[PDB]
Structure formats: C-alpha cells, structure tokens
A paper describes a structure:
We further analyzed the high-resolution structure of the widespread variant, BA.4/5, with human ACE2 using cryo-EM. The hACE2/BA.4/5 complex is very similar to the mACE2/BA.4/5 complex with an overall RMSD of 0.6 Å. The hACE2/BA.4/5 complex confirms this loss of hydrophobic contacts for F486V mutation with hACE2 residues F28 and Y83, as seen with mACE2/BA.4/5, however, Q493 now reestablishes a hydrogen bond interaction with hACE2 K31 residue, an interaction previously first lost with the appearance of the Omicron lineage due to the charge repulsion between R498 and K31. The combination of these two mutations allows for the BA.4/5 Spike to maintain high affinity interactions with both hACE2 and mACE2. This compensatory mechanism allowed for further immune evasion while maintaining adequate binding affinity for the hACE2 Spike.
Here we report the cryo-EM structures of mouse ACE2 bound to trimeric Spike ectodomains of four different VOC: Beta, Omicron BA.1, Omicron BA.2.12.1 and Omicron BA.4/5. All of our structures show that mACE2/hACE2 bind the RBD of the Spike protein in the same manner at the binding interface of a RBD in the up-position.
Residue numbers in the entry:
A (entry chain A): 333 to 525
B (entry chain B): 19 to 613
The structure:
C-alpha cells in the first residue's frame, strides 16, 4: 500500500506567507482522509461540492494542497464569493470551488514574545486577482499623479505589511494555519483514490 | 486619482502602523505600573518617545490634504483628528517657556510642604495629615488655620506663573484659529457639517446656565437644611441668614459635602445597609467579586469577559515583594487585549468599584471594530456615565437580596430611603455649583472679561453669589485661590463632571422606562432585562463615529442635556426637605461677613 503524504503539508515546521502561498500536487497514491482527524480541534472544516463526510469512495485525477497562515478574523474570507483584503489582493477562490478548507489555531508556534515579523501580507495591489494567482512581485505602489522613482515617499508605499504576532492578543488577532484541498477531476485515468 | 482616495490610502497605512506601534507603549506602561523597577521606566519612556515621534511625523504628512474636498464623514473626522497642530504653531522658545511653567506649577503643587508655628519641625504636607485635619476634624481654629495656611503658602507662589500661563495659552489658542483657550476647551462638544444635529461651541454656556436655573431651588433647600444643622453644630459662628464659611464644608475646597454626613443625618439611630460582614461570613474573595459582576452583564444581554482577561489581569494586591500602583484602572491595550488593574479587598465598596470598572471594560469592547482614531466615547462624559449607571443598579436592596447578600427577612423603611437619598445628595447634587462656578470663572479669565486687578475679588464674590459660601478672612490680590486645586494647576478641563452627572440620570431613566419599572426611580434595577441592554449596546457600538447628539437621541430620545431625571430621582428628598424647612429661611445674604 502507498499512502499519500498528508503528513508533510499538515505537520510541517514552518508555513509560508499569505502573499507567497505554497502549492503542492498530490497524485499516484492512496488517500487516507481520516488521518486528517489526528489533530482533532479544527477552527474550520468547511467543504464545498462534496459531502461533509469525506466520501473515501471517490477517485480524482490529482489533488492540490495550499498552505498559509492568516489571522483569526480573516478566516471567513477564504470562501467563494467573498470580498476583503485577503480575498482580493492575496488569495482568491473561484465561484465554482470543489474542495475543503481547514483552519486551526497555531498561537503556540507562530507567536513570540516581542513580535514575529516573519509573516507578511500584500496591501495596495492596484487590481483584484483572478482565482489561483500568486503575484509575489515587490514594487513601490503609486497612489497619485506623480510617478515614483523606485523609492518610497509621500504617495509611494511599500505594498507588503507585517503581522507582528505576539502572545496575549485574543482569538481575533492570533495566528491560524490554513490548508485548502482542491480536487481536479479533468480527463485522464484517476490516480488518487 | 482624486484627493479623497489618496486620503483613504494614507489613512489605511496610518491605521496599520499606529495599531502596531501603540500596543508596545501600552504594554510597557502596564509592565511599569504592575512591576515598578528601573528598567521598566526606561522601556516605558522609550516606547512613549517612539509613539510621540511617529504621531508627529504622521500629522506632518496629514496636513497635506485640504479637507475641503472630502464628502465622506468618517474620513473627514479622522483627518480632522489627525491634522490638529496643538502646541507647535507657536515658536520654540515660547514652547520651552510653557513647558517649564507647567512643570514648575506641577512640582510646586506636588511638594507643597507646610510648616506650623507650634514647632519648627512639625510640618504637615497635603496628602497625609492635612486632608485628615480638614475632613475628620471638628475644631474651628485648627481647620481655620489649615485652610488659611495651605492656601496662602501655595497661592502666593503661583500667581506670576499663572498669569504667564494664561497669556501663553491664549496666544497658542489664537494661533490655532481659536478665539481663546476656553474656546479650545469648549471645542470638544462641537458638531458641525451634519444637518439636524448641528451644535455650536457657544451653545454650551447657554445650555449649562439653563440647566443650573432649574437646579437651583433644590440646592437652596439642601443648603438651608445643612446650614441649620451646622449652626446647631457650631454655636455662635453661623448666622441664620448668612453664608456657610468655606472651611466648615469638610474639604479644603468644598468640592464634596460627603464628609458632612456625620453631622447631618435625618435618623441617626437607623444604620445604613452594610454588606461587608455578610461577604466575610460566606468566605468571599477577589475572584468571587469579579465573577458575580460578570453575571450581572450577562443577565442583561452583553458579552462576557474574554479568556485572556482572567489570565492577564491583576485582581489582588501583589504584596511587599513588588510595588504596584493601587489605583483601579481598566486597560485597553488594543488588538483585543483588555485588562483590569485593581487591589481588591473584601468590602462593599469594592463590589461597586468592580462593577464600574467592568462597565468601562464592556464599553471599550463595544466599539473594538471602529478605526483607531474613532475608538473612544462620543464626548468626554460617557465612560463615567456608563460606569456610574452600572454601579447604581448593583447597590439597591433588591439586587442584594437576589444574590443572597441580604437576608430575606428584611423590609425597607421610610426612614431609610430618605437617609440614603440625603447621603447620596451630599455627594451628587452638592458639587454642581462648585464645578459650574469654577469653570465659569476660568472661562471669564481666559476671555478677558475679568481684568488682572479683579481676580480675587470677582472670585470671592461669585463664590458668595452662586455657591453661597463666604470666605473666612479677606484675601489680598497677591493670592491665587483657584490654583490650590489639582485640576487648575495641571491644565485639566473641569466641565465634564456636570455633563456626566446629567447623562447619568438621563441614561438611568431611559433604561428604567425600557425595563417596565413600577416604583420610584431610586429602586430601579436593569438586571434580567434584555431590551435595555440592546438599547444601550445600540449606542455603545457607535464609538466616536457619530455626533453625540445622535447617540443621546438613540438612548434617551432627546438631543440635548436635561435635568428632569435628576429631579425625579431626588423628588422624595425634596418633599421631605420642604416639609422640614417650615420654620427656617431659604437663601443667603452676601453682605454678611465673619470678619
Ligand atoms: C503531526 O504529524 C503526524 C504524523 O506523523 C500527524 O498524525 C499529526 O496530525 C500531525 N500534527 C498536526 C498536523 O498538527
Ligand atoms: C519584576 O521586575 C524584576 C526586574 O527584572 C524581575 O526580576 C521580576 O521577576 C519581575 N516580577 C514579575 C512578577 O514579573
Ligand atoms: C466612507 O468610506 C467608508 C470606507 O472607507 C465606506 O464604508 C462608507 O460608505 C463611506 N461613506 C459613504 C457616505 O459612502
Ligand atoms: C498646522 O501648521 C502648519 C504649519 O504652517 C500649517 O500649514 C497648517 O495649516 C496648520 N493646520 C492647522 C489645522 O492649523
Ligand atoms: C461566557 O461566554 C461564553 C462564550 O460564548 C458563553 O459560553 C457564555 O455566554 C459564558 N460562559 C459561561 C460559562 O458563563
Ligand atoms: C434574575 O434572574 C435570576 C435567574 O433567572 C434570578 O435568580 C433572580 O432572582 C432574578 N432577579 C434578580 C434581581 O437578580
Ligand atoms: Zn471610571
């Protein structure tokens, strides 16, 4: 038996920032979805297009896993047809999503006394993203009629901001690890079952 | 790109940066207050310096927007808050002079050591001893000596400083497009740009005088009753048709009459409701006190304390191992962090104090979703109003009986309600004329209606005309009597205590009517009522994003201050006082003097 590697995307030492989110492809294995319950307390276990029970009797061509870390206030923005600062400039889901979004609190790992400025998110993108777009470009944002010459000042801002997670904030402003699983059943034989 | 979009982008960036920076300063201040050491002082100073520098540099960029081309009220309010220059439009040497004057007045008031002629080394300072010798004393000569000595020592050292203070602040206000510094203070109650809720800076004076005109008769009756009782207390010293001497009011300044309860009690045989013995007999602690107040807010329909509130707050005295400030305080560190710093004892007063502080905390939690600059009360007198209305309903005998602190074999008597009402009126209604007269005097001084050669004379004749208090002995124009107070020598406004007092009873009557109360207003209880809680939350959630007139209409249904609920609250005491004042003279004559 060859099981899919769900122990590498769910249990990892460090995750990635929201603006640069990590995508992994899973194929040619046997998926044991009940293993996802090994953690147990999940802040969100939403599923769209599939039954609340994972229905281990399904076969797909491949699976995609996307991992990042957000606040607890912005978890509700990871959903089809949602607007905000994360769903417009950082990570967007299509209106016809078929997959599951899992989110759990990770305050004891991603928060430090004095601040944890290693997690960043994008602001002032100048345009809404299309579904599943990354945009890891880092250029000065110009809000005005005077062009910026590559340096910040007055109406010229650096697009990426930091989170600065600390203990003793409150569930609204605490770190949350989010993994999104998408199933792509499009032609070819099915290799994930 | 219109200028409004640039303003919005700037406001977003400023909000994120300020929310990041202010938390560190708040946490450093909390660490210093909880744990007093030397490193904590340095950390707090560094955090404060960083926050001040950031705020200055953001304001400097903030003036870049005209503010005349903004059609959104929220952006306009945030930019108006950010664009104020403050004490920086004037020159640098003048700023240094102003800071030095403020510091020297503050330290002169803080030290203020006073010696005695009995012994060269028997000096008594202000906070210990002098307050005791003026509050719990009964001798005439001793308190007369203290009242003369402290005020003569302090006031004959601050007058040249106070004149330069006044002229410098007037110059700064004039440079900030204000008529005078009194107008700068009054500008907090100003609402403009919204039709139907427009308020002018000059309407405050007229409204305050209109309210005081209706207030006056009850104060006259209470003053006559206190005069009769104190004349019985002091033989051959108080004329029945004159004014009460200043030094016989139980305080250095006469701000509160709460220390006159011992001399003026209707029925001294009956004691008031004290619960401390019942609390001790049931083995209560600080934890139980702060758990029985959370249930009060839950039963009304408001959220309960967060999980970190119990872990991070200090609700007990740390002891002698480390030194902490014992003043109760509700801390809003931001980013969802709410705490309370208090040294709780097993007494009845700490119950009400805990209710007050948790009311403050709930008010803070109500508007946590507002922008950074709009996270405050609508004006300066809503935090305290909410705290006092919360602490007012938890002291009624019905509430004490419900929680079992009062035995079920207990019935209220007509001789106890009057005594409680008089005890509360000696504190609440006895301070309004003092605040009104002090603020009116400072407004007149700032405007210039009082020439510099008429300060003390005008002060001591307004005291006789409005408050009904006559000075013990004449004071020359080399004295600065108002500077003896804490709020005068430290540049603090002294009008919030009037509007807050009115708002207390307005809110209480509104919540009483919402809860279908049947008896008198002084026995109302908002516990177990959800409509009153919802109506209060409707206003608490607004924060500072809407005019205070609109919020007052949301709660009460009126757009201005009203004194009728206070009179409804004090009506039984008023009727009893009128009944007992059949053989006495109401009023006073200013021409009478004790010298
Ligand atoms: C840690 O890894 C194990 C597998 O070795 C897994 O069962 C568990 O759920 C992981 N813990 C997480 C994802 O929090
Ligand atoms: C108070 O500060 C001192 C100074 O470093 C420290 O040793 C002590 O542990 C602190 N106490 C608490 C309760 O944090
Ligand atoms: C003002 O801007 C905020 C967002 O910044 C928006 O929600 C609000 O609707 C605007 N005001 C008006 C009157 O549209
Ligand atoms: C603040 O001071 C600057 C400095 O001259 C001035 O340009 C600006 O108009 C002032 N703003 C206000 C509101 O007084
Ligand atoms: C405190 O709030 C929680 C959070 O919803 C809720 O269970 C209830 O209102 C309160 N809990 C208890 C144990 O009183
Ligand atoms: C409020 O409700 C509680 C529980 O329903 C009840 O025990 C109490 O007697 C009621 N009244 C007061 C004044 O607390
Ligand atoms: Zn308070």
């Amino acid at each position: 038996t060859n099981l899919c590697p769900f122990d590498e995307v769910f249990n990892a030492t460090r995750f990635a920032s929201v603006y640069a989110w990590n995508r992994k492809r899973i194929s040619n294995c046997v998926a044991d979805y009940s293993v996802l319950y090994n953690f147990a307390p999940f802040f969100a276990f939403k599923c769209y297009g599939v039954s609340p029970t994972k229905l281990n009797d399904l076969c797909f061509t491949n699976v995609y896993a996307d991992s990042f870390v957000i606040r607890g206030n912005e978890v509700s923005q990871i959903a089809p047809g949602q607007t905000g600062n994360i769903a417009d400039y950082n990570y967007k889901l299509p209106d016809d999503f078929t997959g599951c979004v899992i989110a759990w609190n990770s305050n004891k790992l991603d928060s430090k006394v004095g601040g944890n400025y290693n997690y960043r998110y994008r602001l002032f993108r100048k345009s809404n993203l299309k579904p599943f777009e990354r945009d890891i470009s880092t250029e000065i944002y110009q809000a005005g009629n005077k062009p910026c010459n590559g340096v910040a000042g007055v109406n010229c801002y650096f697009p990426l901001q930091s989170y600065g997670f600390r203990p003793t904030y409150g569930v609204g402003h605490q770190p949350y690890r989010v993994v999104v699983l998408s199933f792509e059943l499009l032609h070819a034989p099915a290799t994930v079952c | 790109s219109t200028i409004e979009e640039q303003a919005k982008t700037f406001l977003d960036k400023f909000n994120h940066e300020a929310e990041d920076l202010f938390y560190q300063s708040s946490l450093a201040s909390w660490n210093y207050n909880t744990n007093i050491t030397e490193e904590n002082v340095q950390n707090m100073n560094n955090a404060g310096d960083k926050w001040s520098a950031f705020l200055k540099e953001q304001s400097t960029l903030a003036q870049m927007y005209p503010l005349q081309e903004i059609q959104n009220l929220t952006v306009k309010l945030q930019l108006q808050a950010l664009q104020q220059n403050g004490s920086s439009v004037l020159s640098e040497d003048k700023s240094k002079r102003l800071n030095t004057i403020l510091n020297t007045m503050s330290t002169i008031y803080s030290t203020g050591k006073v010696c005695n002629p009995d012994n060269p080394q028997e000096c008594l300072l202000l906070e210990p001893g002098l307050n005791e010798i003026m509050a719990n004393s009964l001798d005439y000569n001793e308190r007369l000596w203290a009242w003369e000595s402290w005020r003569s020592e302090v006031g004959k050292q601050l007058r040249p400083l106070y004149e330069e203070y006044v002229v410098l602040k007037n110059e700064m206000a004039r440079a900030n497009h204000y008529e005078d510094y009194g107008d700068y203070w009054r500008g907090d109650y100003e609402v403009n740009g919204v039709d139907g809720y427009d308020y002018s800076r000059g309407q405050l004076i007229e409204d305050v005088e209109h309210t005081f005109e209706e207030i006056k008769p009850l104060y006259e009756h209470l003053h006559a009753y206190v005069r009769a009782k104190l004349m019985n207390a002091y033989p051959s010293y108080i004329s029945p048709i004159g004014c009460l001497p200043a030094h016989l009011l139980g305080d250095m300044w006469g701000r509160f009459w709460t220390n006159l309860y011992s001399l003026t009690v209707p029925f001294g045989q009956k004691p008031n409701i004290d619960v401390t013995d019942a609390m001790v007999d049931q083995a209560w602690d600080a934890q139980r006190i702060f758990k029985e107040a959370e249930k009060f807010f839950v039963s009304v329909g408001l959220p309960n304390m967060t999980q970190g509130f119990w872990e991070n707050s200090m609700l007990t005295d740390p002891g002698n191992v480390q030194k902490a400030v014992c003043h109760p305080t509700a801390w809003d560190l931001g980013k969802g962090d709410f705490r309370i710093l208090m040294c709780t004892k097993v007494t009845m007063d700490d119950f009400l104090t805990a209710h007050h502080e948790m009311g403050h905390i709930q008010y803070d939690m109500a508007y946590a979703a507002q922008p950074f600059l709009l996270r405050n009360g609508a004006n300066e007198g809503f935090h305290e109003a909410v705290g006092e209305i919360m602490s007012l309903s938890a002291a009624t005998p019905k509430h004490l009986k419900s929680i079992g602190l009062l035995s079920p074999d207990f019935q209220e008597d007509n001789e106890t309600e009057i005594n409680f009402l008089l005890k509360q009126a000696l504190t609440i209604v006895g301070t309004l004329p003092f605040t009104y007269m002090l603020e009116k005097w400072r407004w007149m001084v700032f405007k210039g209606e009082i020439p510099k050669d008429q300060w003390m004379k005008k002060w001591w004749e307004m005291k006789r005309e409005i408050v009904g208090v006559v000075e013990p002995v004449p004071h020359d124009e080399t004295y600065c009597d108002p500077a003896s107070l804490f709020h005068v020598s430290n540049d603090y406004s002294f009008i919030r205590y009037y509007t807050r007092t009115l708002y207390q009873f307005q809110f209480q009557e509104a919540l009483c009517q919402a809860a279908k109360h049947e008896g008198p207003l002084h026995k109302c209880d908002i516990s177990n009522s959800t409509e009153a809680g919802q109506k209060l939350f409707n206003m608490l959630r607004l924060g500072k994003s809407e005019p205070w007139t609109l919020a007052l209409e949301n709660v009460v249904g009126a757009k201005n201050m009203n004194v009728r609920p206070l009179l409804n609250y004090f009506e039984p005491l008023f009727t009893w006082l009128k009944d007992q004042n059949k053989n006495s003279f109401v009023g006073w004559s200013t021409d009478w003097s004790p010298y």
